[PDB]
């Protein structure tokens, strides 16, 4: 069945960006997806997105901007020490100038640069650039 | 040979070998 709701979300956003759309409908919504969206919105890869309540599970309408080229989830939420995060950002992100490994720490869901600045590390959620 | 025929020839050889084994035992 639908195992990772965020995987569905990011697959939808990537497919629609490749297709050329300006808005997507993420069908099931979850807190982690919302935080992912807040991160991308703060960094500017997304325009203005909207949540919809349904008393069963939220829906999300994300207005893209085409600035995004590819998101993606690392579906097994691996464990990364504060040292291996450099290995992960070398593996996933194209160049060190930009691109962000969005990961969840005890301090919250947040990108790898803020996570390094707070000196915390947790489980990997995905990668956006 | 056709692989079919190779299998059939091998089966006949197995049959003969089993007959010889039953005779020996």
């Amino acid at each position: 069945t639908r195992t990772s709701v965020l995987a569905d979300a990011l697959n939808a956003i990537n497919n629609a960006e490749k297709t050329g759309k300006r808005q997507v409908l993420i069908r099931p919504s979850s807190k982690v997806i919302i935080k992912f969206l807040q991160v991308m919105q703060k960094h500017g890869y997304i325009g203005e997105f909207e949540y919809i309540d349904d008393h069963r599970s939220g829906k999300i309408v994300v207005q893209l901007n085409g600035r995004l080229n590819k998101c993606g989830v690392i579906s097994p939420r691996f464990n990364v020490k504060i040292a291996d995060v450099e290995k992960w950002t070398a593996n996933l992100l194209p160049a060190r100038q930009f691109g962000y490994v969005i990961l969840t720490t005890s301090a919250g869901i947040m990108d790898h640069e803020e996570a390094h600045r707070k000196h915390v590390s947790g489980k990997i959620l995905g990668f956006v650039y | 040979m056709r692989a079919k025929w190779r299998k059939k020839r091998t089966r006949r050889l197995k049959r003969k070998r089993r007959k010889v084994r039953a005779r020996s035992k």
């Binding site: 579906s75 097994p76 939420r77 691996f78 | -």
Partner: protein
């Protein structure tokens, strides 16, 4: 997708899966089963000493027309008899009958090489002195 398990707690299945599929590589199977020891003419050894039993001119493969002069040698380490090639032009006459001959691999991972059928090993030394030194007249056979 990629029909191998991927969850966090699937280390066991992946490990056993890799251990099981490693049996496909020929090199790994040879290493684990120790085929280089039990059945190979050399006990996983580069060289071994032996005694020449008689000398044979093996005819080459298809496109090559010649006779490649080899010698059958009984290995002294275990007693298995095996043929072995002798390099260079005037070297078979340099190999005495029933003489101490040292054999090495033939350069193709223990497989027959070139146009020589069924022969798998060179000749590097005969009666102590090497064959190359004899061929270039660097040394004389001890003829003992």
């Amino acid at each position: 997708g990629k029909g191998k398990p991927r969850g966090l707690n699937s280390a066991r299945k992946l490990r056993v899966h890799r251990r099981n599929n490693r049996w496909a590589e020929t090199t790994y199977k040879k290493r684990l089963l120790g085929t280089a020891f039990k059945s190979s003419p050399f006990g996983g050894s580069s060289h071994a000493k032996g005694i020449v039993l008689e000398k044979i001119g093996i005819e080459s493969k298809q496109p090559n027309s010649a006779i490649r002069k080899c010698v059958r040698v009984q290995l002294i380490k275990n007693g298995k008899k095996v043929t072995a090639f002798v390099p260079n032009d005037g070297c078979l006459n340099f190999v005495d009958e029933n003489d101490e001959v040292l054999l090495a691999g033939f350069g193709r991972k223990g497989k027959a090489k070139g146009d020589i059928p069924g022969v798998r090993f060179k000749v590097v030394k005969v009666s102590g002195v090497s064959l190359l030194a004899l061929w270039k007249e660097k040394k004389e056979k001890p003829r003992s």
